[PDB]
Design a protein around this ligand. Structure first.
Ligand SMILES: [Zn+2]
Ligand SMILES: [Zn+2]
Ligand SMILES: [Zn+2]
Ligand SMILES: [Zn+2]
Ligand SMILES: [Zn+2]
Ligand SMILES: [Zn+2]
Ligand SMILES: [Zn+2]
Lengths: 151, 265
């Protein structure tokens, strides 16, 4: 068992992701290594990320699903909860992880995080201050980074 | 050839016998240590082996020398069935071989096959494989939907997530579900979750950008180290917050207060 169990579950999640893909997400194994995936999220409509293509890297632990996956952006994005290293401040990836959760539900959570940031528990305090104080400036800068880094 | 005083076998699988403690010239499985029926825990978990003094462990070994394991028929049995009508002694690995149950709460009682706790009683969602036939290797949850899991999968979940985050996978029950798990034999460590205890876990997460990205850094400790006051303190960009520097490397002053980096201009 163990690693074999993680492999079987990751195949199951990959097939499910293929047949019922989350909105504006697509993800898959990189080559023949199924513990390393690459994903893309299209910037949601009616958000300052619209039109962008945002790339994410996923690493499944050896104890999956008993440890959460490690998920990071490789695309620069202007977001209160995503730092310059692409790290994501997201509860279901750290403290609300359950082995019942699936990579497809991780991806939904990240898209919702793009639509609805959490500035009261921020990963980049300056961007959270701007988000709370001057929303239009926030949206303008997020659009500018979408055009500069994600298009 | 290191061996356990209480069960007299190789260290084996930590998932099943616990971490193989060896300290102060003594060697014991952690489960053998806390599950032995008569070993007093009389210290700070700093002191001795997690609150078990070596004098007391040695004396427990001596007592257990006068006990035959009903499984392997050899001396050294450190665990006794806690049913009132039973006198069966056994080693912990031998009890697992014969399907004995060990509880990890209160008096840490252990039971043999005939007198162990039971429950009235598809694919285990945790592993996504078909439930084991032998209904002693499966386990329900009282919380909701009467969900059944592999025993091994729930134990692995309890070990990785640990007490603080161990909950019903569906309804997030943290009161009745773990109590029912305890009474049927699930170890629930009182420790932080596994994904928090990884080396360098969530290190580059947060790790508030602290690095001097000026054309030349004016400071010996370098772009990597900072202080609290003076021209050697750290300042970050007003918008990105991901590009910063030692104050004097931009040769700036406390009379502006709003630093925007090269990029955010
Ligand atoms: Zn032992
Ligand atoms: Zn034995
Ligand atoms: Zn008994
Ligand atoms: Zn299972
Ligand atoms: Zn439940
Ligand atoms: Zn500097
Ligand atoms: Zn900047």
């Amino acid at each position: 068992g163990g690693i074999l169990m993680a492999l079987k579950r990751i195949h199951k999640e990959l097939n499910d992701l293929a047949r019922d893909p989350p909105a504006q997400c697509r993800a898959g194994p990189v080559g023949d290594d199924m513990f390393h995936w690459q994903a893309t999220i299209m910037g949601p409509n009616d958000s300052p990320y619209q039109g962008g293509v945002f790339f994410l890297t996923i690493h499944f632990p050896t104890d999956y699903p008993f440890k959460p996956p490690k998920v990071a952006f490789t695309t620069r994005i202007y977001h209160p909860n995503i730092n310059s290293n692409g790290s994501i401040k997201l509860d279901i990836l750290r403290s609300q992880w359950s082995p019942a959760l699936t990579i497809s539900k991780v991806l939904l959570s990240i898209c919702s995080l793009l639509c609805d940031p959490n500035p009261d528990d921020p990963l980049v305090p300056e961007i959270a201050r701007i988000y709370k104080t001057d929303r239009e400036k926030y949206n303008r800068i997020a659009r500018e980074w979408t055009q500069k880094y994600a298009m | 050839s290191p061996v356990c005083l209480l069960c007299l076998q190789e260290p084996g699988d930590p998932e099943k016998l616990g971490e193989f403690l060896q300290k102060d010239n003594l060697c014991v499985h952690y489960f053998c240590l806390i599950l032995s029926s008569r070993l007093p825990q009389k210290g700070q978990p700093n002191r001795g082996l997690h609150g078990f003094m070596p004098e007391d462990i040695k004396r427990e070994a001596v007592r257990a020398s006068k006990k035959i394991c009903f499984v392997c028929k050899k001396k050294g049995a450190a665990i006794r069935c806690q049913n009132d009508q039973c006198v069966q002694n056994f080693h912990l690995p031998c009890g697992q071989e014969r399907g004995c149950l060990s509880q990890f709460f209160g008096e840490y009682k252990s039971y043999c096959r005939k007198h162990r706790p039971t429950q009235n009683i598809e694919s285990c969602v945790l592993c996504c494989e078909n439930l084991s036939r032998t209904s002693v290797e499966n386990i329900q949850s009282p919380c909701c939907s009467q969900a059944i899991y592999h025993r091994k999968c729930i134990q692995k979940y309890a070990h990785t997530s640990a007490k603080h985050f161990f909950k019903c996978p569906q309804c997030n029950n943290r009161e009745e579900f773990p109590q029912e798990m305890l009474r049927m034999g699930i170890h629930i460590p009182d420790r932080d979750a596994a994904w928090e205890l990884e080396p360098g876990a969530f290190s580059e997460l947060y790790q508030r950008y602290r690095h001097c990205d000026a054309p030349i850094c004016l400071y010996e400790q370098g772009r990597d180290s900072f202080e609290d006051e003076g021209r050697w303190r750290l300042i970050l960009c007003a918008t990105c917050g991901s590009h910063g520097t030692h104050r004097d490397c931009s040769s700036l002053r406390p009379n502006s207060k709003k630093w925007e980096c090269n990029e955010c201009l």
